Amino acid sequence: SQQTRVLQEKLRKLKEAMLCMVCCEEEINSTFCPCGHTVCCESCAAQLQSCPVCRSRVEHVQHVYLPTHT
Amino acid sequence: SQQTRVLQEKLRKLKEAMLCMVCCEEEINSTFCPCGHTVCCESCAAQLQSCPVCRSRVEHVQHVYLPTH
Ligand SMILES: CC(=O)Nc1ccc(Nc2ccccc2)cc1
Ligand SMILES: [Zn+2]
Ligand SMILES: [Zn+2]
Ligand SMILES: [Zn+2]
Ligand SMILES: [Zn+2]
């Protein structure tokens, strides 16, 4: 039904929000510290000097294990 | 249809996986450092000396800003 199409769209949007903001291909699994923005996969987070969201200096990257990881 | 029920269940499970594993009421927004397990809201994470997933000592809690929030 049309309700099935609405639910498919909600699911797709939630899944796309879990993907890296730089490569759009890999799941987010890394946090820029100390700001806390968690928006990249490990590879894209590795060479950024400043956070791509808030411009704060990246002192280090913390790996995150999330229950939504697939 | 039956597919509407199946999709409602998938959405419910994905939403529940984003909720705190301790209180089941608030969104996950905190990481136990250094282990990296990110399974609690800030209120439950503040009260745990050891990670509830791996039992490693919590040196500190890092707040996480996620796009799904
Ligand atoms: C099997 C056992 O004794 N404990 C155990 C170990 C790893 C996970 N993995 C995991 C948890 C939360 C978030 C992302 C991954 C869950 C439970
Ligand atoms: Zn990436
Ligand atoms: Zn930031
Ligand atoms: Zn909680
Ligand atoms: Zn842990």
From Swiss-Prot, chain B:
It comes from the Eukaryota. Residues 64-66 are annotated as: Critical for homodimerization. A zinc finger (RING-type) spans 20-55. Ubiquitously expressed. Induction: Expression is directly activated by NR1H2 and NR1H3. Expression is not dependent of the sterol-response element-binding proteins (SREBPs). Expression is indirectly induced by LDL. It is found in: Cytoplasm; Cell membrane. Autoubiquitinated. Disulfide bonds: none annotated. The RING domain mediates ubiquitination and the neurite outgrowth inhibitory activity. The FERM domain binds phospholipids and mediates lipoprotein receptors recognition at the plasma membrane through their cytoplasmic tails. Homodimer. Interacts with the E2 ubiquitin-conjugating enzyme, UBE2D1 (via RING-type zinc finger). Interacts with myosin regulatory light chain (MRLC) and TMEM4. E3 ubiquitin-protein ligase that mediates ubiquitination and subsequent proteasomal degradation of myosin regulatory light chain (MRLC), LDLR, VLDLR and LRP8. Activity depends on E2 enzymes of the UBE2D family. Proteasomal degradation of MRLC leads to inhibit neurite outgrowth in presence of NGF by counteracting the stabilization of MRLC by saposin-like protein (CNPY2/MSAP) and reducing CNPY2-stimulated neurite outgrowth. Acts as a sterol-dependent inhibitor of cellular cholesterol uptake by mediating ubiquitination and subsequent degradation of LDLR. This is E3 ubiquitin-protein ligase MYLIP. It comes from Homo sapiens (Human). The gene is MYLIP. The chain holds residues 369 to 436 of 445 of the full protein.
